[PDB]
C-alpha cells in the first residue's frame, strides 16, 4: 500500500498543466522538420525507383502517428506497384538487394540489412538530417496502428499532451526502449489511451466499436494515470486492451490488431519492478507540492532521473555487455 497524498492546490495544479503541455511543445517536431521528413521520403522513392520500378514509399510509426519526437527514427513502408501484396514475394532477398542499392547513395551511411526479426528491414543513417531510417516491405499492420493512434490524437488535445508527457517520463526513467529490455513507446501510449477510455467520464471512446464530457485538466489526468496504474489496476487479472470498453481477463498489453501480440511479453521481473518503482516516484513528485522560487527549470525538477529512479540504472541482465541491446549473445555482436 502507498502513502496518501495531500490535497491539490489550484496553484500547483496550474503548474502541472504547464509541464504536461510543455512536454508536447518542447519535444514534438516542428512543421519544417516534418516537411523535411517528407522530402527524405520523396528522394528515397526516386532513388529506389531506379532499381525497383514502381516503388512507393510511405511514412508510418512516430513520423505520422502524432506522438513522435525530434530525432525519432524515420519508419518507411515500401510497396511496388503491380504487387498488391507480399504473397510469394521473397522479402529477405528483396531487403538484401535493396541494401546493396542504397550503398551507392552518397548521403547514407552504415547500410544494414536485418533479416533476424519477424519483419526484415533495411537500416541506415541519413547525414543530411541526422536520422536513422528503417525501410520495411509491406508493413500494413504498422500503418494501421499509425492510423488508429493518429485518430485518437485528433479527438482531444489532452490525448497528445498526455502521450508526450508519458513519453518524456519513460524516456527520462530509462524504461522506454524495448530493444534494451523495457517497453516500447507504443506500449506506454496504449496505457495512456486505455486509461482515458476507462476514466469516468471517458475522455476518448473505443474507435473500434463505432463526447468531450470529461472536463479534467491535463494535470489532473496525468497524476490520475500515475495513481491509476499504482493503486488500482490489477496487472494480472486484467489486460490493458484499448480494443473495447469491457474489461478483458487474462504486465500484459494487447495489440489492438494483432490480438496474439502481447507488448509486455518480453518483460523481466526486476524490470517490471523497476518500472512500477518509477511510477510510484512520479506519483510522489507530481502529486506532492521552495517550488517555484528556487528552481530555474520545472522540467528538471519533475523529470529528475536521480529522483524518479533513485540514481539507479535500468536493469540490463538480458543485454549484451558490449552493446547493451537484447537479441544476441556476446559473440555475434557488431
Ligand atoms: Zn550486442
Curated annotation (Swiss-Prot):
It is found in: Cytoplasm. It comes from the Eukaryota. Residues 217-261 form the PAP-associated domain. Residues 1-334 are annotated as: Sufficient for monouridylation activity. A zinc finger (CCHC-type) spans 318-334. Mg(2+) binds at residues 73, 75. UTP binds at residues 62-65, 72-75, 145, 167, 185-189, 261. Interacts with MOV10; the interaction is RNA-dependent. Belongs to the DNA polymerase type-B-like family. Utilizes two multidomain functional modules during the switch from monouridylation to oligouridylation. The catalytic module (containing the 3 CCHC-type Zinc finger domains) is essential for both activities while the Lin28-interacting module (LIM) at the N-terminal part is indispensable for oligouridylation. Uridylyltransferase that mediates the terminal uridylation of mRNAs with short (less than 25 nucleotides) poly(A) tails, hence facilitating global mRNA decay. Essential for both oocyte maturation and fertility. Through 3' terminal uridylation of mRNA, sculpts, with TUT7, the maternal transcriptome by eliminating transcripts during oocyte growth. Involved in microRNA (miRNA)-induced gene silencing through uridylation of deadenylated miRNA targets. Also functions as an integral regulator of microRNA biogenesiS using 3 different uridylation mechanisms. This is Terminal uridylyltransferase 7. It comes from Homo sapiens. The chain holds residues 986 to 1361 of 1495 of the full protein.
Amino acid at each position: 500500500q502507498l502513502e496518501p497524498l495531500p490535497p491539490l492546490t489550484p496553484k500547483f495544479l496550474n503548474i502541472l498543466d504547464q509541464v504536461c503541455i510543455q512536454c508536447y511543445k518542447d519535444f514534438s517536431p516542428t512543421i519544417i522538420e516534418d516537411q523535411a521528413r517528407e522530402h527524405i521520403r520523396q528522394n528515397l522513392e526516386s532513388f529506389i525507383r531506379q532499381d525497383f520500378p514502381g516503388t512507393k514509399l510511405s511514412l508510418f510509426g512516430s513520423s505520422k502517428n502524432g506522438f513522435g519526437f525530434k530525432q525519432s527514427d524515420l519508419a518507411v513502408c515500401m510497396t511496388i506497384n503491380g504487387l498488391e501484396t507480399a504473397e510469394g514475394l521473397d522479402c529477405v532477398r528483396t531487403i538484401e538487394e535493396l541494401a546493396r542499392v542504397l550503398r551507392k547513395h552518397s548521403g547514407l551511411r552504415n547500410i544494414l540489412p536485418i533479416t533476424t526479426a519477424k519483419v526484415p528491414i533495411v537500416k541506415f543513417f541519413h547525414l543530411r538530417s541526422g536520422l536513422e531510417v528503417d525501410i520495411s516491405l509491406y508493413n500494413t499492420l504498422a500503418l494501421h496502428n499509425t492510423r488508429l493512434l493518429s485518430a485518437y490524437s485528433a479527438i482531444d488535445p489532452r490525448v497528445k499532451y498526455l502521450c508526450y508527457t508519458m513519453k518524456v517520463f519513460t524516456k527520462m526513467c530509462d524504461i522506454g526502449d524495448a530493444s534494451r529490455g523495457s517497453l516500447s513507446s507504443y506500449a506506454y501510449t496504449l496505457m495512456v489511451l486505455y486509461f482515458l477510455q476507462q476514466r469516468n467520464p471517458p475522455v476518448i471512446p473505443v474507435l473500434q466499436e463505432i463526447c468531450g464530457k470529461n472536463t479534467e485538466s491535463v494535470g489532473q489526468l496525468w497524476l490520475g494515470l500515475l495513481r491509476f496504474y499504482t493503486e488500482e489496476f490489477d496487472f494480472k487479472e486484467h489486460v490493458i486492451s484499448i480494443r473495447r470498453k469491457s474489461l478483458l481477463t487474462t504486465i500484459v498489453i494487447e495489440d489492438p490488431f494483432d490480438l496474439n501480440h502481447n507488448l509486455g511479453a518480453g518483460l523481466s521481473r526486476k524490470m517490471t519492478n523497476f518500472i512500477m518503482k518509477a511510477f510510484i516516484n512520479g506519483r510522489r513528485v507530481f502529486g506532492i507540492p521552495g517550488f517555484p522560487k528556487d528552481y530555474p527549470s520545472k522540467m528538471e525538477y519533475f523529470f529528475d532521473p536521480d529522483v524518479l529512479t533513485e540514481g539507479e540504472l535500468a536493469p540490463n541482465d538480458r543485454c549484451c555487455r558490449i552493446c547493451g541491446k537484447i537479441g544476441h549473445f556476446m559473440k555475434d555482436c557488431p
